[PDB]
Amino acid sequence: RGFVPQKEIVYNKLLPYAERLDAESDLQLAQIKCNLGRAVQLQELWPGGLFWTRKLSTYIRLYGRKFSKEDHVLFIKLLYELVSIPKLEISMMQGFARLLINLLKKKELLSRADLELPWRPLYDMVERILYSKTEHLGLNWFPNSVENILKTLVKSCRPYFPADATAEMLEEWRPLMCPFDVTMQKAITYFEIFLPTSLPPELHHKGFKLWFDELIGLWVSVQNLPQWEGQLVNLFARLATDNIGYIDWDPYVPKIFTRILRSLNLPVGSSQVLVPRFLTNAYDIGHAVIWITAMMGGPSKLVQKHLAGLFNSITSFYHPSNNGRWLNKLMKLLQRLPNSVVRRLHRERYKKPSWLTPVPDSHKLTDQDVTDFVQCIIQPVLLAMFSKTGSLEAAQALQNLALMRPELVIPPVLERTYPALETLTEPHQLTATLSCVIGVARSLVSGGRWFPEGPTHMLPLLMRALPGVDPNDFSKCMITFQFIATFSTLVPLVDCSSVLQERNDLTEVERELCSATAEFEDFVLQFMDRCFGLIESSLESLVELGLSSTFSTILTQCSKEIFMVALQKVFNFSTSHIFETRVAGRMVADMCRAAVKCCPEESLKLFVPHCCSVITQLTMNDDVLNDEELDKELLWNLQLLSEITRVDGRKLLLYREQLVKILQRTLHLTCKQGYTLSCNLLHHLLRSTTLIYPTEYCSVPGGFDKPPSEYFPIKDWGKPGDLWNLGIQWHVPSSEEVSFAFYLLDSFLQPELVKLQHCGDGKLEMSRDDILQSLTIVHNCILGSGNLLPPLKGEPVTNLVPSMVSLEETKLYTGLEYDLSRENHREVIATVIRKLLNHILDNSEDDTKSLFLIIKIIGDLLQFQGSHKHEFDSRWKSFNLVKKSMENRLHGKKQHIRALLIDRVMLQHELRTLTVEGCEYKKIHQDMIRDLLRLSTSSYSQVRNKAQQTFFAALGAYNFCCRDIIPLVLEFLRPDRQGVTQQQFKGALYCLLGNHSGVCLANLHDWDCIVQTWPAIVSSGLSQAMSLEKPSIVRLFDDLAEKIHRQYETIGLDFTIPKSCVEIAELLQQSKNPSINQILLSPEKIKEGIKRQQEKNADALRNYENLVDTLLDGVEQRNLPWKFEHIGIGLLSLLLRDDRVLPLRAIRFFVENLNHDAIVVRKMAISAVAGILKQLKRTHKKLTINPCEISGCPKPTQIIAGDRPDNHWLHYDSKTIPRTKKEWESSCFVEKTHWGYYTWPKNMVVYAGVEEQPKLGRSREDMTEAEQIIFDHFSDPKFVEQLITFLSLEDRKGKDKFNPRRFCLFKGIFRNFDDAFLPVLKPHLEHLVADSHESTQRCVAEIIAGLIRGSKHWTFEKVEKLWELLCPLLRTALSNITVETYNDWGACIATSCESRDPRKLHWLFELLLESPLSGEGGSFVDACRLYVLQGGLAQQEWRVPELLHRLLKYLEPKLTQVYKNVRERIGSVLTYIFMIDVSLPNTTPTISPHVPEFTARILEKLKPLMDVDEEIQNHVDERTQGIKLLKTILKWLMASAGRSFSTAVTEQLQLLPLFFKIAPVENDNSYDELKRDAKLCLSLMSQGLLYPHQVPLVLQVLKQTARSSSWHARYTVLTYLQTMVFYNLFIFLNNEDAVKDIRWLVISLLEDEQLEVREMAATTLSGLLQCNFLTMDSPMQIHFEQLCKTKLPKSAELVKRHAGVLGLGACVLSSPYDVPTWMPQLLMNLSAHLNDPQPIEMTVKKTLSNFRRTH
Ligand SMILES: O=P(O)(O)O[C@H]1[C@H](OP(=O)(O)O)[C@@H](OP(=O)(O)O)[C@H](OP(=O)(O)OP(=O)(O)O)[C@H](OP(=O)(O)OP(=O)(O)O)[C@@H]1OP(=O)(O)O
Ligand SMILES: O=P(O)(O)O[C@H]1[C@H](OP(=O)(O)O)[C@@H](OP(=O)(O)O)[C@H](OP(=O)(O)O)[C@@H](OP(=O)(O)O)[C@H]1OP(=O)(O)O
């Protein structure tokens, strides 16, 4: 046609009316182009621009793309330039972004030659919304799902960025890469979001080869778990997948795999624990799996060797006995890894050539490369089949592993399935080995040309699973139903066993597989007695969904020969075994309609004459009409006929006459089991006759009951997909059955509609049980015949919204062609039920049953067109669960069982008939929602609750109708509307609360609906039909105020579409592939558009400043309870703008109630006034320095990090602080603590001098008149004494903190006024540091912090006057520090010098590093003043090298001289002293203290402890002070283990052999606080990453101190090696000399003189041999067996036999849950050493007991 579609939805072509969808969707696309290009040009963003955005979205939910490549680009460019507007409302930016994700989601449709989206407006967009500077002060209020929808919005646009973007993302975030602060996190989040990885290989040199070596050297050089390196592995996983025949990963793979194994955080060793170690994040296996599977392949498998080694290391932990907290993530590795290999194989093989860069032939997965993956991973998968958590994530692994290698996967799972389904003592296995045969099923039934036996296992295993259909287990009867249903769609069970005339053309498998087909009667009848007994003895509405699901699945897959036997067996059981009508007859009648739904013409012939005759014989007496019990043979046959008839309606027009006659008599029969079972008979009779649905659902198209059985149905087991030759048998309603539906509606709806219309009059005094009956008939008649009768129409409601483009409904066809010459039957029913609602709600108020049906009939007159929304939702959910469990992912043409592939076209039809867009609100619908409200606010709470759910669904159905009813919900909660009721008020505010996932009506988006609602919701506190004494009314106003504060998004006040969005929108309304011929836009109304928009964002301003004023008028209204003013202030606290300053009266309000008598309002006021002082801040001017213009040096290239010469002037040096006003005014003062560490930015800001800054010290006449209010309050003593009285008061005793909310209050005070308030404050905070209270010291710490941070932009005279004040204040405050107080001054000082220049606040450091370790106050103030100082030197990282040298020079004389609580602080402080000496790549050696230089001076001092003769542990010269030193440095290494970037440097390694001989052996019990201190330090230090150059050095240390004379030392080096290998194990496995050194070390220590170290060496040999780090050699057996034969000595002799026996025991204990081939001969050798004397006897006995307890 006129344009080329671009990946349509396939399922639109398969509809019965698919000829109509071409002419329809071309018109809708033309309207979307026209009224989106108009709407952006017009800047009608709210009613028109966001409308046709929302209608373009539902054009893609319905039709796929179906627009040109030329026109796809136009939508992308328009909604990209329009989603990135620098001050655009974030609330409606959500819709533009969600469409823009949806337009770039399928990446293969554009090609970078069609689209070149810039990256800068996305970065300015994320900075505004992820690193917002005003959200924490409460001025912005984003939606909650924003970060997750913008990180995918940038992810969507990222493959289309310009080629130069990487190089200009690396000059803008590379300056932020200082690893010591929080701005490294910002850099690596922006790299993980923005930095492009999918570029063609023609320009890899402008992509990842411009940052990769840098960023992965940065990745490898750290050993912590920073929160940014998990951001960084998310980045390399994306890089590895997109570029696979490229970056080698070969130097890196032994580090990726070993960090993944560390992330699995398996407990290894003799109870060595890691409380300190990072357990929380950084290694999701979703991305680690992706990164593993993208590295394997190519010429060097290396990656497959590591992957096999990984699963050899974890094989103990996948065993079902060994479950733990690790298992939730080890199951994730196992379920996600074969899936991602399936997706790689599909990417490489069965995915078509496209724009995306294809994988090279050199790096595709080969035959052996994927066979080796199956061979490595399957034993943990089979081991995890029997897991206690529930076998779900092993079945998915078995599904994906059987797509690639079914011959390696299926025979083990049925080797474990046939015994499991045979047993009766292990029932955990049946649920395991049947759920794991569900996923293996499509591979099992196919064969696959190398596993042909496959299917022959089907019908044996299908028959043997029949006792699972069980009344006793719900749990196995579910999986048995779900097993029989999945192994019967996969087989046409036509009896193809009468083929012995077919001497050739068959296989020896196919012959044996067709002469087993004859047992298909013996399956569908033995199955069916299992299903009869379960009914006869019948959580249970699922075992009739499963029952009727698998029985309908069976019965469409059986031939007409099998079906007649099943039909006779259904019929005799339903006919002669009379059933109760609640649970058992509900099951039989749904088993009956499976047989009726299959072959409609023969099965219906049995039931409908029988059930009509048996109902006719039992209804004959004519006193059964007014009998209110109905003897229960009529109930069952009436239920049977009721559900027998939801079938193909064309095949039921034969039984037309004598089925209306069964409705002529039973509908008016007074028993609500029996007109209900006869009106749902009427329901299922209409909707079988009216609605469009497929009829067959078979696996083989359009046939399957065919007389020639000479061809061969059992070579078709599978046949997946075939979308094109599909052949859906649709039931489209013919004119005959539409005529039957209207006759059945004119015979059973019209009389009782006349009856209810008279009942609305003064005729027909009608019973309440008779009104309910007639409404029940009307409800089921509408609810069946919905598709025929067209929806409600009428005149449009008038005064809602000016609408310059258009507001048009979507007209979707759905295949029926409404008869408009008949009287619409929705309108007459609405006419009757409105008048009957007036009758009931005025005459019979208490009719709690019919009234509900007025609610349901309003709810379906207004909504229901043939399809239920909830049923379609349930079906959709079911579809993805069935689709994912049968997903042949490897193959890529939507191959699926024809059953769910027909069900998906039916879902496309239901999605099509169910989505009706923003249709005109049309005053007949207004009366539906007026009258509904009358039910929403009614006498009974249950009719209110059910009435509000159809009310909330009525409001999301009509555009601009939430705004229509705002003042009618709000009538009842007016203060002056006299006497509404208690229940009308409670109903109006439930109505105004909404529900969890719909409209709210109290927090709608416009101004015109908040300015109404919020003053009503505060002013409903003085209402006199209002009672807070009721505990539900308090709960709802707390829910109302709680929901709005949770869901307010900032609104509007500016909408101005720029001259870039209108430029690209003119081209979209003039594109001519598809169009309606619409006129060029007149500039007369490109002037009325600006005219309407400028006055539309003018009453946004009017409504905002009106809302603030009337919240203020309401919150102080002469008698209002404290709840409502606490509500009305929090709602007012939501209105701190940042586009404007707050209203003058609200500034007055929040300032005057800082000192309010309620502490809740005081905290709201602290937050609000901090927001006010941020709104009122004067902008400080910046200049640009060249950083080689103050330093005077060439600022070299080849970018190097760390302390440089151009960096050096920015360091704190004690000889260059200004000290005068002239050296201060001529100085640079780079404030941030990261600028210039890594590199300098393109331009760099300075904060220029005071002569150009905003002038400070104003005299209140120069102030901006809202500074007047804060000045006139914060400068008088009375306000300040009340403020500091309320603000030094204890709130939560023991739970109070520093509270940075109150710090932001005083930081803004001393940032806007700065000079006059502290003379008012100096007596108050002079008094406040002298108090030995807790909360008074809290109060002054917040004021001192905000006063120090506030003095950032002051004059030298004014900061000089500030520090003459603050120095004695801080001296007194740190001398009077307390246990209740110390971590509050630690937050005061760390807060007061974060993001500040250290030279500017040098008075802190001279006060606070003078004597932290002094002695007055004793201990604990030495520890806490050295802690308060610690946060101060911690915030000023890398930039204060000396003063960290001054602290090291101060405090090396004091490591010996100090108490227990202080050397912990000494250790944490030395950790923060040596943070800056990093081994990070290309980092210049720091000016900061070096950690090797210090620990050499320690090694000098600690020398007399580590010498010969081994006497240690006295702690009572240069030896006891060495013990005292070793205490302090042991607490240092404690804190250094998890914090420093390069843990355990090469001179923090000679500290080990001295720590080995002093650590204990067995227990963690109380040993001198120096042994247990050395035990946990050793346990905490093996558990830590090593470098590859470092694993020779540590192992050289270990074999040195395993050769010592201390057996405690030789024990603990052998536990150290035990934890040190498995944590970061590969690093050692990527060293052929380290594995040999470790095996020589463990074999050597296995023959020591101490028995304990021999047992420990056996334990660690057995553990290193278990994880396969160490291989059990043939020389290893020779050495052990030649030690076993030593002699009895007639020791030096018995120790050798014990060594050899102990090594053999290590070898047989290394395989706990498996006997390998070498074990039986090896275990006979240990049997010859039982009577071998002690200690060999105990080793043999413990070894063999430990053997056979696990085998
Ligand atoms: O309509 P649904 O239910 O939301 O699900 C859609 C998905 O959502 P979307 O249409 O974008 O909203 C979309 O997947 P993503 O875009 O997220 O990747 C399609 O993938 P695509 O076809 O582009 O990708 P490929 O073909 O798998 O390579 C379809 O996934 P497959 O079945 O794997 O694809 P097949 O339809 O079988 O061809 C799937 O069609 P179904 O309706 O049958 O589930
Ligand atoms: O002094 P700090 O506590 O470090 O806070 C500053 C300060 O913001 P406030 O004055 O609102 O606290 C800067 O404002 P000026 O003093 O330079 O006017 C602001 O810079 P911008 O106003 O240019 O945003 C900067 O924010 P940023 O670091 O994003 O530039 C921000 O630092 P924090 O982000 O650490 O608060």
Author numbering: 24 to 561, 578 to 1555, 1565 to 1738, 1753 to 1813
Paper text:
PA200 is a 200-kDa monomeric nuclear protein involved in spermatogenesis, DNA double-strand breaks (DSBs) repair, maintenance of mitochondrial inheritance, and proteasome maturation and assembly. Binding of PA200 protomers to 20S CP generates the asymmetric single-capped PA200-CP complex or the symmetric double-capped PA2002-CP, both of which enhance proteasomal degradation of small peptides. Although proteasomes generally catalyze ATP- and ubiquitin-dependent proteolysis, the proteasomes containing the activator PA200 can catalyze the ubiquitin-independent degradation of acetylated (AC) histones by using its bromodomain (BRD)-like (BRDL) domain for recognition and binding. Here, in an effort to understand the mechanism underlying interaction between PA200 and 20S, we used cryo–electron microscopy (cryo-EM) to characterize the 2.72 Å–resolution structure of PA200-20S CP complex and 3.75 Å–resolution structure of PA200.
PA200 is shaped as a dome-like structure composed almost entirely of α-turn-α modules known as 32 HEAT repeat (HR)-like modules. The other 31 HRs continue almost all the way to the C terminus and spiral through a 1.5-turn left-handed solenoid resembling a snail shell. Moreover, three long loops interconnect HRs, the largest one being loop 1 (89 residues long) located between residues 1,215 and 1,303. Although the resolution of PA200 was much lower than that of PA200-20S complex, the overall comparison of PA200 and the PA200-20S complex gave an RMSD of 0.78 Å with 1,719 aligned residues. Some regions (i.e., residues 562–575, 1,809–1,843) vanished in PA200 but were evident in the PA200-20S complex, suggesting that these flexible regions tend to be stabilized by intermolecular interactions. Surprisingly, there are other two pores with prominent openings (henceforth referred to as openings 1 and 2) located on PA200. One is sitting at the top of PA200 with the size of 19.6 × 13.7 Å when measured between Cα atoms, whereas the other is sitting at the side of PA200 with a size of 23.3 × 17.8 Å when measured between Cα atoms. Even more surprising is that the side chains of several positively charged residues outlining the two openings point toward the center of the respective openings, where they bind notably well-defined densities. The refinement indicated that the density map bound by opening 2 corresponded to InsP6, whereas the density map bound by opening 1 was identified as 5,6[PP]2-InsP4 (C6H20O30P8) because of extra densities at two adjacent groups. In the human PA200, although the 82-residue BRDL domain folds into the same geometry as typical human BRDs, it does not share significant sequence homology with them.
